[PDB]
């Protein structure tokens, strides 16, 4: 680590004697959970899409100018969870950087693990949007889907 | 939360607000330190010093006092742990304490106990840079090698 010093600071430095250093940082890791819910579990999908993506900027400076549509499918719950949050993050990660001002789940077939859902935005701009944190991934760990009234989601997702 | 620009701001009025319904919990991060030594007490006064070194420059630190931190554990990995942790708690805790350097005097390997001195002052915002605040010390892949090239590996949750 190197840190931005002061005069003062560097002549405190200089003033004393080196210190020997035989030491270095390794494997940095950050994460936060996404706590989210709604009246369905559709909604409750949809609302961790929209916390994932409130965490990289401000979705209300995104302009409503495209659609994009994921699909996807799991085998339970807490696997199609997963699985939605990885496909959103890669249509932001790769090919069109695109974001979601918001996320709609149209339909989460709960028999078969199945998922349709749409998102309307723009491709991602530093000039337009504010820079909030970079997501990396989605984890399992501490997964918890409750499909119960007022549906929870719990899950948490790898940051820089 | 954020801080918008005026464009930024238009945007947002200029269409309907998005209903949020979700909420950021526990945030958690960790590095793993790795240091080494001529020999295990240079090993483990050198993971101290990486600890200690995430939260500041601690050349920037003055050495104008002395504490001492003795600990023990039940084996190498425990005295490790109990070593970094009351060095933690000296910063942490009562005076916030931060050494420029420290020095583990012996490590007993037959029973587990050490004694090592820190040299320093208390910290402030006003004269040391800012780093990253240290909460604890985990056991996650702790590694304590001691054959010729000691070293240890201890991972640390932060912020």
């Given at each position: 680590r190197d840190y931005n010093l002061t005069e003062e600071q560097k002549a405190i430095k200089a003033k004393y004697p080196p210190v020997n250093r035989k030491y270095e940082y390794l494997d940095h890791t950050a994460d936060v959970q996404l706590h989210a819910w709604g009246d369905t579990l559709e909604e409750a999908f949809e609302q961790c899409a929209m916390a994932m993506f409130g965490y990289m900027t401000?979705?209300?400076?995104?302009?409503?100018?495209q659609t994009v549509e994921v699909e996807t499918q799991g085998d339970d719950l807490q696997s199609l969870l997963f699985h939605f949050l990885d496909e959103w993050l890669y249509k932001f990660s790769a090919d069109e950087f695109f974001i979601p001002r918001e996320v709609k789940?149209?339909?989460?077939?709960?028999?078969?693990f199945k998922l349709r859902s749409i998102g309307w935005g723009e491709e991602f701009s530093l000039s337009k949007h504010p820079q909030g944190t970079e997501v990396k991934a989605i984890t399992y760990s501490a997964m918890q889907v409750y499909n119960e009234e007022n549906p929870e989601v719990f899950v948490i997702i790898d940051i820089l």
């Open positions: 401000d979705t209300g400076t995104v302009e409503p100018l789940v149209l339909s989460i077939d709960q028999r078969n």
